[PDB]
């Protein structure tokens, strides 16, 4: 059965991005909305919409394709997994693509990027790398 909803989200994004789909819809969760909001904030995705469904909600993500159809998201990777959870200290926070990419971190200060985590000096679980 479904074991990693976050990983599913990132794969759906990866798959839709490969085929250059404009939008994708996925089942919603609070964590997945937060991840989506960072991606829009960092300019990886155009827009995030939430639709109430009387179940768990639906997230609609609109993907960004640059001029010449160049993809703004090149790759996404799940770091912490149900099989093996990965945590880092603020000092040890990883840089993705030498700052060209981002790391999404779950911290006691909320789900945030690696830059904010180093700034706030708060470490946590490394959810994923997006570049």
């Amino acid at each position: 059965t479904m074991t990693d909803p976050i990983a599913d989200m990132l794969t759906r994004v990866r798959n839709a991005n490969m085929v250059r789909h404009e939008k994708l819809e996925l089942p919603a969760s609070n964590i997945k909305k937060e991840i989506a909001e960072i991606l829009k904030s960092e300019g990886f995705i155009k827009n995030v919409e939430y639709v109430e469904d009387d179940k768990q909600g639906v997230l609609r993500l609109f993907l960004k394709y640059g001029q010449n159809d160049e993809r703004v998201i090149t790759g996404l990777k799940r770091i912490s997994k149900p099989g093996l959870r990965v945590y880092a200290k603020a000092s040890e926070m990883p840089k993705v693509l030498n700052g060209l990419g981002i790391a999404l971190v779950s911290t006691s200060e909320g789900v945030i990027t690696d830059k904010e985590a180093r700034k706030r000096n708060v470490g946590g679980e490394i959810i994923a790398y997006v570049w």
């Binding site: 300019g43 960004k64 090149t74 693509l97 030498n98 700052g99 060209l100």
Partner: protein, 156 residues
């Protein structure tokens, strides 16, 4: 463009009479200023094979992003079973790479890099893997443009 002959191979086709031999050359071409190319040429004689390879390499030239004589970010170029990891290095590190990779990186005008061939050691596939890695290299300006941010905003 500077030209370096990576490998020369005597190849054979079997006919009724026996084996007929030709020479294949793999050549890297570069301006040593962010443009590099690779080509293969086959001929009965090595000079003619080299010449054809040079002409092929000039036809396909790839633009390489460079940050002060190094690459912008770490990358693993993969082609077939060929895999080449390339990590940016500080000045004075030198080119730490083996065989075909060295030729491609030097002719692209990269003077400082950390590299390891993780896959096949077959010369052509190593070169193609290296070129793949360089092609997937990205610069902050382009990433900023694509993500609709300033370079400063990219690094926070």
């Amino acid at each position: 463009f500077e030209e370096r002959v990576v490998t020369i191979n005597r190849v054979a086709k079997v006919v009724k009479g026996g084996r007929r031999f030709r020479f294949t050359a793999l050549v890297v071409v570069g301006d040593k200023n962010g443009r590099v190319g690779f080509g293969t040429g086959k001929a009965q004689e090595v000079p003619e094979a080299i010449k054809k390879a040079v002409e092929a390499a000039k036809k396909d030239l790839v633009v390489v992003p460079r940050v002060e004589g190094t690459t912008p970010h770490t990358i693993t170029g993969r082609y077939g079973s060929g895999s080449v990891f390339m990590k940016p290095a500080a000045p004075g590190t030198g080119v730490i790479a083996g065989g075909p990779v060295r030729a491609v990186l030097e002719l692209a005008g990269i003077t400082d890099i950390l590299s390891k061939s993780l896959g096949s050691n077959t010369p052509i596939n190593m070169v193609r893997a290296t070129i793949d890695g360089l092609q997937n290299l990205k610069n902050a300006e382009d990433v900023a443009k694509l993500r609709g941010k300033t370079v400063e905003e990219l690094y926070n």
